[PDB]
Amino acid sequence: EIVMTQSPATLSVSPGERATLSCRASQGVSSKLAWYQQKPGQAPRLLIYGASTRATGIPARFSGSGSGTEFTLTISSLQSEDFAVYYCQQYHNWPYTFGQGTKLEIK
Amino acid sequence: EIVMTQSPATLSVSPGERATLSCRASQGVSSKLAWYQQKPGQAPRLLIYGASTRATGIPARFSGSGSGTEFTLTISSLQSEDFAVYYCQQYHNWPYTFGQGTKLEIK
Amino acid sequence: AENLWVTVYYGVPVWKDAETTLFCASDAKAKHNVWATHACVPTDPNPQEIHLENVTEEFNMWKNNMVEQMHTDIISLWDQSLKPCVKLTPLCVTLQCTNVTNNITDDMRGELKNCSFNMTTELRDKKQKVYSLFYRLDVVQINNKEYRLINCNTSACTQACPKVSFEPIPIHYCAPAGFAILKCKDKKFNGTGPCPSVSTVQCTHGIKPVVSTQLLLNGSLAEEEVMIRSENITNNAKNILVQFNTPVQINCTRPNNNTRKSIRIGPGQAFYATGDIIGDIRQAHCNVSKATWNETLGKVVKQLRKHFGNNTIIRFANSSGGDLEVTTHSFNCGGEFFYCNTSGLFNSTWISNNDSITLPCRIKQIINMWQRIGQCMYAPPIQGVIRCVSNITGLILTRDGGSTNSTTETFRPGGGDMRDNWRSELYKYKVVKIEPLGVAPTRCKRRV
Amino acid sequence: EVQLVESGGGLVQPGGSLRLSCSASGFTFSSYAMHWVRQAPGKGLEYVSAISGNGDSTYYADSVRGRFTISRDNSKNTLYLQMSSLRAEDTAVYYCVKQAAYCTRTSCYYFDYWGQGTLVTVSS
Amino acid sequence: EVQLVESGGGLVQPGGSLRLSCSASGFTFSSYAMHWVRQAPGKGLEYVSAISGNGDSTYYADSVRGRFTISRDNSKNTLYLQMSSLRAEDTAVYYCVKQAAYCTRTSCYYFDYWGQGTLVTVSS
Amino acid sequence: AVGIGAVFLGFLGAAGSTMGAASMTLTVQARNLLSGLTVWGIKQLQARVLAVERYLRDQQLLGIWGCSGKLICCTNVPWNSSWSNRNLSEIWDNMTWLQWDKEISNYTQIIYGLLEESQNQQEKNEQDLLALD
Amino acid sequence: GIGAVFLGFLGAAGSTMGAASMTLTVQARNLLSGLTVWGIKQLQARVLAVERYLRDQQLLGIWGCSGKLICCTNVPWNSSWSNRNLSEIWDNMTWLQWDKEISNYTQIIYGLLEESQNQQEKNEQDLLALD
Amino acid sequence: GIGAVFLGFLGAAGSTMGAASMTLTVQARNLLSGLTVWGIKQLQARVLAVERYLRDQQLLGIWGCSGKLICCTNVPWNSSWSNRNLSEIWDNMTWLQWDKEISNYTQIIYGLLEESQNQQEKNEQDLLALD
Ligand SMILES: *[C@@H]1O[C@H](CO)[C@@H](O[C@@H]2O[C@H](CO)[C@@H](O[C@@H]3O[C@H](CO[C@H]4O[C@H](CO)[C@@H](O)[C@H](O)[C@@H]4O)[C@@H](O)[C@H](O[C@H]4O[C@H](CO)[C@@H](O)[C@H](O)[C@@H]4O[C@H]4O[C@H](CO)[C@@H](O)[C@H](O)[C@@H]4O)[C@@H]3O)[C@H](O)[C@H]2NC(C)=O)[C@H](O)[C@H]1NC(C)=O
Ligand SMILES: *[C@@H]1O[C@H](CO)[C@@H](O[C@@H]2O[C@H](CO)[C@@H](O[C@@H]3O[C@H](CO[C@H]4O[C@H](CO)[C@@H](O)[C@H](O)[C@@H]4O)[C@@H](O)[C@H](O[C@H]4O[C@H](CO)[C@@H](O)[C@H](O)[C@@H]4O)[C@@H]3O)[C@H](O)[C@H]2NC(C)=O)[C@H](O)[C@H]1NC(C)=O
Ligand SMILES: *[C@@H]1O[C@H](CO)[C@@H](O[C@@H]2O[C@H](CO)[C@@H](O[C@@H]3O[C@H](CO[C@H]4O[C@H](CO)[C@@H](O)[C@H](O)[C@@H]4O)[C@@H](O)[C@H](O[C@H]4O[C@H](CO)[C@@H](O)[C@H](O)[C@@H]4O)[C@@H]3O)[C@H](O)[C@H]2NC(C)=O)[C@H](O)[C@H]1NC(C)=O
Ligand SMILES: *[C@@H]1O[C@H](CO)[C@@H](O[C@@H]2O[C@H](CO)[C@@H](O[C@@H]3O[C@H](CO)[C@@H](O)[C@H](O)[C@@H]3O)[C@H](O)[C@H]2NC(C)=O)[C@H](O)[C@H]1NC(C)=O
Ligand SMILES: *[C@@H]1O[C@H](CO)[C@@H](O[C@@H]2O[C@H](CO)[C@@H](O)[C@H](O)[C@H]2NC(C)=O)[C@H](O)[C@H]1NC(C)=O
Ligand SMILES: *[C@@H]1O[C@H](CO)[C@@H](O[C@@H]2O[C@H](CO)[C@@H](O)[C@H](O)[C@H]2NC(C)=O)[C@H](O)[C@H]1NC(C)=O
Ligand SMILES: *[C@@H]1O[C@H](CO)[C@@H](O[C@@H]2O[C@H](CO)[C@@H](O)[C@H](O)[C@H]2NC(C)=O)[C@H](O)[C@H]1NC(C)=O
Ligand SMILES: *[C@@H]1O[C@H](CO)[C@@H](O[C@@H]2O[C@H](CO)[C@@H](O)[C@H](O)[C@H]2NC(C)=O)[C@H](O)[C@H]1NC(C)=O
Ligand SMILES: *[C@@H]1O[C@H](CO)[C@@H](O[C@@H]2O[C@H](CO)[C@@H](O)[C@H](O)[C@H]2NC(C)=O)[C@H](O)[C@H]1NC(C)=O
Ligand SMILES: *[C@@H]1O[C@H](CO)[C@@H](O[C@@H]2O[C@H](CO)[C@@H](O)[C@H](O)[C@H]2NC(C)=O)[C@H](O)[C@H]1NC(C)=O
Ligand SMILES: *[C@@H]1O[C@H](CO)[C@@H](O[C@@H]2O[C@H](CO)[C@@H](O)[C@H](O)[C@H]2NC(C)=O)[C@H](O)[C@H]1NC(C)=O
Ligand SMILES: *[C@@H]1O[C@H](CO)[C@@H](O[C@@H]2O[C@H](CO)[C@@H](O)[C@H](O)[C@H]2NC(C)=O)[C@H](O)[C@H]1NC(C)=O
Ligand SMILES: *[C@@H]1O[C@H](CO)[C@@H](O[C@@H]2O[C@H](CO)[C@@H](O)[C@H](O)[C@H]2NC(C)=O)[C@H](O)[C@H]1NC(C)=O
Ligand SMILES: *[C@@H]1O[C@H](CO)[C@@H](O[C@@H]2O[C@H](CO)[C@@H](O)[C@H](O)[C@H]2NC(C)=O)[C@H](O)[C@H]1NC(C)=O
Ligand SMILES: *[C@@H]1O[C@H](CO)[C@@H](O[C@@H]2O[C@H](CO)[C@@H](O)[C@H](O)[C@H]2NC(C)=O)[C@H](O)[C@H]1NC(C)=O
Ligand SMILES: *[C@@H]1O[C@H](CO)[C@@H](O)[C@H](O)[C@H]1NC(C)=O
Ligand SMILES: *[C@@H]1O[C@H](CO)[C@@H](O)[C@H](O)[C@H]1NC(C)=O
Ligand SMILES: *[C@@H]1O[C@H](CO)[C@@H](O)[C@H](O)[C@H]1NC(C)=O
Ligand SMILES: *[C@@H]1O[C@H](CO)[C@@H](O)[C@H](O)[C@H]1NC(C)=O
Ligand SMILES: *[C@@H]1O[C@H](CO)[C@@H](O)[C@H](O)[C@H]1NC(C)=O
Ligand SMILES: *[C@@H]1O[C@H](CO)[C@@H](O)[C@H](O)[C@H]1NC(C)=O
Ligand SMILES: *[C@@H]1O[C@H](CO)[C@@H](O)[C@H](O)[C@H]1NC(C)=O
């Protein structure tokens, strides 16, 4: 079972700067990585699929990149509503596995 | 480009004898050789196609032979009207190439 | 009308650049050749070539996998031919050599050494005192006149089988079904960039595996004019490949009536030594017509100014230096390996406005082909007088760096890598991979 | 717009049974696979079970295999998860999830939409 | 009996334009390819251009490619050759030629009947 | 397909021709995809194995699409405009197969899977229809 | 509907025969592509794969099922081979379980299929003669 | 036949062409199954078998007879090839005898079949484009 490692566990960035979230896979998952955002008390929302493609209705701030084992999520213009736990999921090998999450804090 | 060489450049034979014209190709053209006769101030006329087959309406005295790289045209019974420039043409490799001509002169 | 459906087409004319295993085909007209052409498929007597109208393809003679494949195949064939022959391990002994001074000209003074040594007999407990003639380039003084073979501290030479012939036989490189070889028919192609006139063939023309260093021998000539080809002409570290439109005849000879002497060095093993030159001893040399060489060099200069300028002084100078295999026109002629001093050829300066040249040549018996260290070959002596006539089809030149406002450019011959010998012939060929399956939209729909 | 609403979660004693229902609207229900994903408190999301569009094939995580049962009602656009013999570690927030796409020559188990989720608590 | 008659040839200045026509009768025009063959004075026959039976495919020699334009009108059984930016070496006698046969498994670009031909001169 | 009035037909002859024109010469390419110890012997063996592999690679794809033994085979898969938005005339008259391959290369795998699924569905539907007799 | 969770090589090996029959192309497309010591093993593997694929294709061809995933035949099912109901074969059995049952009778079925295909070809030739 | 004494590889080699035509599958099913130089030679033999089978299949395909044991064609029989009656071919000689007679004219027939299939494919394509 592919293990998804998300670092750092917690990240604190003030509004307006770029926040980089990194996800690592125990083995190569090609470009099959998806990013989800889960604000407290709400269901997760898909942000990126295929590691680079943005889901419909997702602003241009969220940019995803990476392939194989190393993946990163970039939020160029952080805003007051980007506070949420971000999960990276691989859909290359069944069962699909999620990362432990990266809590983003508004400094 | 396959080069067709005709030897001799000019051949002189009196009426009634056999006349032999030789055409040589730079590369093997199998049986894809044709012979044309061009009287002065007249359009060329097909004599032999396939190096051995006679075009319709051609006198039987015109005989062509050969295969591969060496071909010969034999006119068993030369006659007065059999005065013209004889061209050999290959249709094995595009573009088709013609011989330089063998001016036949009545002796 | 607005609804389109996928239609599957099989056999569409599409291809992609690819690297494949090209097999050999040889004329059946011609089992004692280094290039085992007896194992090559017979060639088509009338090769088929299709003219690809409207097709423009990108060629690159300097990144052609065909050259690497040919290099590997040639080396493998050389090694395979040398595998069954005699191994000259016993020949690595101390030699008591003395100069050959029996009717020797001044030039050929000190070149031949008369070496006597103890050699193993067919019986392991008996030795025979034999003697042989060795060229000065093969023996090394031990430090009395005690010598040893040049290779004794690097490897043991494998004597070339006398029956096996070194004559280059043309090789046609054929691609497997599902692959095609595209030939660039452009007469002014410079080895790189698009080729407006292209054609597809299944086998290349007969490419002789001629091995030479400074002069390209027995090659194919340019159809229109001399062609200068370089990976990067501006760079001075890249060799320049020159192709002649008309050949320059070169007459190489070995004016020594050599005698072959068979020495039995073991059970069923014979070492072929040089017994004695019958008659006078003269240096080997090659001749090229002075007028023809001057004309070809003038054409080369004329075509060289296109890349440097109409008002630049083009001068040719002999090789800078290095080992004898790079500083001399190395080649094999009738089984004997020559190393000619091409100083009289590349010696002239060209401003922007009957006889023959004799090139003194040295001969070796211990040969280190393919620039490999630790794997040498001993060429047995060839009885009689050797004489071969070849065509100088091209050159492998090298420019001199350090422009610093250079109104003059200096070009010197340079060999070394043997791929440049193959590259001069496989420059117009490239291997492609066919993709017969294609899908396109059409109004047709499958009936249910 | 796509909407997924869960229901049926609540307090259940260990070894008991519980059924969750997810009413899906806004898309062709029968054409997309539906998954159940749970997030135990203080832990990340993990896979529970999945079912194909027509319901022929159902997949189960090793932990829940043999105890849970996923089923769908394409006519009513509903997704069910019948848990039996629950344990203390089955307590989590269960999300009914819609697979983003259906692909034949690759893998596409990423999720377009997630249900609000219903908390299931197993305790005495 | 197959007749091929040329027309349009004459005197044209270098860099000018010229159009030739070849009316063909006595055979199915659309079923055979048509070629243009030129014979420069004191030289042998040379290939200029060719066109398939239905006119979808046209072939040109390297010398004339990009300047000439071969076309045919199957309706009126006519073959045209439009020349542009003519040069001195383009002067020759151009024959409109009928290809012998059509083969899908071999090469058959030999010629049954040749037109009389027309003289084209390029000079100032 | 039978080359009426064709100047000449040869392997990859219509490589520079438009897709419409090159579609009438499929037989020319199709029939040449199978026919055409020492160092040379090994190379010949590898070449033969490569030829067989490459031929069967396309033959299998044709077989599982229901197009076995066909040069032009219509399918039930509708053309998604996302793959290519060019008009039919813009494809079959102003483009060559080499150019086309460079455009739909990104979407080849998607199309192949769709063709395979459609063929499977057709086979199942035909089985069901025949089961009613 | 078309809502497969995921399709992969042998992914339906555990599914019922009916459900696994909708993923035939998944297996069929991976049957051709899923000197040194390592240089000969690769060549042998390639040749072996080609041979196995061609054996299967030949068996399909001589049965009249060439280029087909699901091909119907004229050979009636013999209750001796398997007496199980249709419902309990296509909904309560996997292809792996089925294969272990019809194994002592596979050659008989193959011979019957070949004979039936030959008879069909002969009959079709006879009928075309009348026209 | 419907009931045969025994069917074996080349068993009908001596039967008349009519009787031997009911055992085509018997021969068709045996055309594919049957470091060092021995390994290389074995590999060459296996590759040769595969190539021969594929060549036969391609020949069938380019004639339009893909995956058929008996395929009717549109090529008329030229009496020059053989003047024997239908009854005297299918009931008075064997395939081996027949092959020795039309061996000279085999390539002509193959070329005619290929060209006829080309014409049929053109007709199919034109009719399809017409609709
Ligand atoms: C560029 O290309 C040119 C031509 O394409 C090439 O020149 C040719 O070189 C070859 C090999 O050096 C020459 O062939 C040799 O010719 C000599 C002389 O033969 C003469 O006499 C015979 C009649 O006997 C005539 O038929 C012939 O035309 C000549 O007039 C032969 O002696 C050679 O044969 C011996 O060596 C062969 C191995 O190469 C053996 O296979 C053969 O059996 C012969 O061996 C016998 O003699 C040996 C010497 O006495 C002895 O040691 C053996 O034990 C045995 O007894 C060979 O046929 C050819 O004539 C040249 N052609 C021209 C026009 O000059 C260039 O070499 C080439 N350049 C490069 C760099 O590759
Ligand atoms: C290599 O590539 C060249 C060009 O890249 C190809 O040559 C072109 O071939 C096409 C045919 O596919 C030619 O197009 C046809 O031209 C005919 C004549 O054009 C003249 O006359 C028309 C009026 O009728 C003028 O408008 C035009 O400007 C010219 O003066 C047209 O009659 C044809 O139209 C017919 O067919 C089209 C289908 O394409 C229909 O839509 C029309 O309604 C009509 O029925 C057609 O347009 C083109 O002219 C050629 N260009 C050249 C020679 O420069 C070679 O064929 C190609 N060769 C290979 C082997 O690939
Ligand atoms: C791995 O293996 C497991 C178990 O072997 C498979 O899971 C089973 O999948 C089958 C279908 O593939 C399930 O059977 C179906 O259940 C549906 C829901 O069940 C409810 O309704 C039935 C009666 O309708 C009740 O008996 C049951 O208690 C539930 O209340 C039914 O709706 C289905 O019936 C419909 O389809 C069948 C066709 O199969 C028709 O015959 C019926 O008439 C009706 O139309 C069907 O009965 C079964 O419940 C699952 N068992 C589990 C999950 O434990 C996996 O699919 C399999 N996975 C893989 C990849 O192989
Ligand atoms: C290379 O050196 C060898 C000797 O190591 C030379 O061979 C030997 O030459 C001498 C003098 O020519 C020979 O001696 C003479 O022999 C003849 C014939 O038997 C005899 O009549 C004389 O009285 C005298 O003894 C000797 O036999 C000969 N061989 C050996 C084994 O010594 C050889 O000539 C030299 N070659 C060259 C090119 O210098
Ligand atoms: C034998 O020949 C060798 C090679 O020419 C001679 O060795 C050297 O030759 C050069 C050139 O004349 C001299 O400068 C050296 O002094 C020679 N080396 C010495 C003398 O050790 C060698 O002298 C020759 N011997 C005889 C006897 O002729
Ligand atoms: C070949 O071997 C012989 C003896 O095996 C060598 O001759 C001897 O050489 C040694 C060393 O100088 C002397 O001490 C002996 O007196 C010699 N004996 C005889 C009988 O000659 C001879 O030099 C060797 N020849 C070579 C190496 O060329
Ligand atoms: C094998 O021996 C040769 C000759 O003795 C060596 O070549 C010489 O190497 C020395 C090393 O200091 C140089 O100074 C000389 O200039 C070299 N001369 C020639 C003619 O090469 C060679 O290096 C030795 N090879 C090995 C591997 O020991
Ligand atoms: C060197 O080039 C000459 C051409 O100048 C070659 O001689 C020609 O060889 C061909 C092939 O046998 C003949 O058809 C020509 O008639 C020859 N012409 C002349 C002028 O000799 C010669 O064969 C070449 N030598 C090589 C490549 O070794
Ligand atoms: C061909 O060679 C020239 C000179 O070696 C290259 O030009 C040099 O490029 C490097 C890096 O691009 C620069 O650092 C040098 O200053 C350049 N020197 C000159 C004289 O231009 C040139 O890039 C090469 N061509 C290609 C295609 O690589
Ligand atoms: C190369 O050319 C030289 C002349 O520069 C040739 O040498 C002449 O050969 C003839 C042949 O008998 C002699 O009569 C002359 O006395 C020699 N002149 C010299 C040596 O200056 C030489 O033979 C030629 N080599 C070839 C053609 O291989
Ligand atoms: C090279 O030397 C050999 C001697 O080994 C010469 O062969 C002799 O030739 C003459 C004339 O044909 C014969 O009468 C002798 O019987 C031969 N002796 C032999 C073969 O041992 C050969 O002619 C010489 N060649 C040259 C070019 O000088
Ligand atoms: C190289 O040798 C060839 C002969 O092998 C020479 O060609 C001969 O040249 C003479 C000129 O004196 C002519 O009389 C002969 O007719 C030529 N024979 C052939 C077969 O060509 C050639 O001249 C020599 N070239 C050089 C540069 O030495
Ligand atoms: C290139 O030519 C130069 C001069 O023409 C050669 O250098 C001479 O070499 C000889 C013998 O090695 C010496 O006696 C001279 O003193 C050298 N002169 C100079 C100016 O260097 C050089 O050896 C030649 N190179 C090659 C590879 O042939
Ligand atoms: C190649 O030949 C040249 C001359 O043709 C050699 O250079 C001359 O060598 C001699 C001694 O052999 C010197 O006296 C001259 O001064 C040198 N220069 C000339 C003649 O211009 C050159 O050394 C030869 N190459 C090799 C490697 O020996
Ligand atoms: C290289 O070229 C130079 C100049 O052409 C040659 O030098 C001349 O050689 C001749 C012949 O010995 C002398 O008469 C001249 O005095 C030399 N001029 C000089 C040195 O400036 C030189 O011999 C050539 N080298 C070769 C052919 O190896
Ligand atoms: C070769 O030709 C190409 C295209 O004309 C050009 O880009 C390149 O610089 C040339 N290389 C040379 C002249 O060395
Ligand atoms: C080569 O020819 C040119 C032009 O005829 C001449 O200037 C030059 O001196 C010649 N080279 C010589 C004679 O070495
Ligand atoms: C060099 O001269 C040639 C003709 O000899 C000319 O075509 C070319 O333009 C000239 N080059 C320059 C840079 O002047
Ligand atoms: C194909 O995909 C590559 C990689 O995503 C992209 O760079 C390229 O632009 C695409 N081309 C087309 C025609 O879609
Ligand atoms: C199949 O045959 C084997 C060996 O004869 C026998 O052991 C087994 O019980 C048989 N099983 C079936 C299902 O026919
Ligand atoms: C039969 O073939 C011969 C040549 O062998 C030919 O002359 C004859 O016209 C052909 N007849 C038919 C009907 O095909
Ligand atoms: C076939 O041709 C050969 C000659 O090539 C001839 O001997 C034989 O009789 C012919 N067989 C026939 C016509 O059946």
Numbering used by the authors:
A (entry chain K), B (entry chain E): 1 to 107
C (entry chain C): 31 to 60, 65 to 141, 150 to 185, 188 to 309, 312 to 321, 321A, 322 to 398, 411 to 505
D (entry chain J), E (entry chain D): 1 to 52, 52A, 53 to 82, 82A, 82B, 82C, 83 to 100, 100A, ...
F (entry chain A): 512 to 547, 568 to 664
G (entry chain B), H (entry chain F): 514 to 547, 568 to 664
Show me the paper's own sentences about this structure.
To define recognition details, we determined the cryo-EM structure of 2C06 in complex with BG505 DS-SOSIP. We obtained a 3D-reconstruction map at 2.95 Å from 645,442 particles utilizing C1 symmetry. Binding of 2C06 induced asymmetry in the trimer; specifically, interactions of complementarity-determining region 3 of heavy chain (CDR H3) from two of the Fabs with the C-terminal helix of a neighboring gp41 subunit served to position this helix closer to the two Fabs and to the primary protomer. This movement of gp41 C-terminal helix was observed with two of the Fabs, not the third, and enabled the two N-terminal residues from the third fusion peptide (residues 512 and 513) to interact with the C-terminal helix of a neighboring gp41. Fusion-peptide residues 514–520 interacted almost exclusively with the heavy chain of 2C06; these residues formed a U shape, looping back to interact with trimer. The fusion peptide was flanked by CDRs H1 and H2 on one side and CDR H3 on the other, and its binding involved an average of ~470 Å2 of buried surface area (BSA). Overall, the cryo-EM structure of 2C06 in complex with BG505 DS-SOSIP revealed 2C06 to bind at the fusion-peptide site of vulnerability, with heavy-chain CDRs accounting for most of the interactions with the fusion peptide. Residue G644 in the 2C06 complex had tight interactions with R100A side chain of CDR H3, which played an important role in binding fusion peptide. Mutation of G644 to other amino acids would clash with arginine at residue position 100A, contributing to the strain-specific neutralization of 2C06. Overall, the results indicated that binding by antibody 2C06 could partially accommodate the presence of a glycan at position 241, whereas antibody 2C09 clashed with glycan.
The HIV-1 envelope (Env) trimer is protected by multiple mechanisms of humoral evasion, including conformational masking, glycan shielding, and sequence variation. Here, we analyze B cells from a phase I clinical trial (VRC 018) assessing a prefusion-stabilized Env trimer from strain BG505, fixed with an additional disulfide (201C–433C) to comprise DS-SOSIP, which stays in a prefusion-closed conformation even in the presence of human CD4.20,21 We sorted B cells with stabilized trimers with their bases covered with glycans and sequenced and expressed constituent antibodies, for which we assessed binding and neutralization. To investigate elicitation of HIV-1 neutralizing antibodies in humans, here, we analyze B cells from a phase I clinical trial of the “DS-SOSIP”-stabilized envelope trimer from strain BG505, identifying two antibodies, N751-2C06.01 and N751-2C09.01 (named for donor-lineage.clone), that neutralize the autologous tier-2 strain, BG505. Though derived from distinct lineages, these antibodies form a reproducible antibody class that targets the HIV-1 fusion peptide.
